[PDB]
């Protein structure tokens, strides 16, 4: 209780945030309503 | 007996800054009714 000191503390309960910041957008609207088609080979073709 | 003139107490002092100072002072004294009412045996080594 003499000459209060608050900087030399040993056990400091860190004031860490409980989240993470991520801004990478993931819109991709086209692929969501285009429709996919399954195949059975590594090569597909179409007539022209 | 334990002769106490100033009992122990926490005494807050001036700040003069961004901190808080305190003090724990006390004044005590020892008393013995008779010098021969107690014995003191000093430990000594070999001769």
TrEMBL record, chain A:
Name listed for the protein in its UniProt record: Major head protein
Organism equals: Escherichia phage vB_EcoP_SU10
Taxonomy, top ranks, is: Viruses, Duplodnaviria, Heunggongvirae, Uroviricota, Caudoviricetes
UniProtKB/TrEMBL annotation, chain B:
Q: What is this protein called?
A: Major head protein
- Tell me where on the tree of life, at the top rank, the source sits: Viruses
Q: What taxonomic lineage is listed for the species of origin? A: Viruses, Duplodnaviria, Heunggongvirae, Uroviricota, Caudoviricetes
Protein's organism? Escherichia phage vB_EcoP_SU10
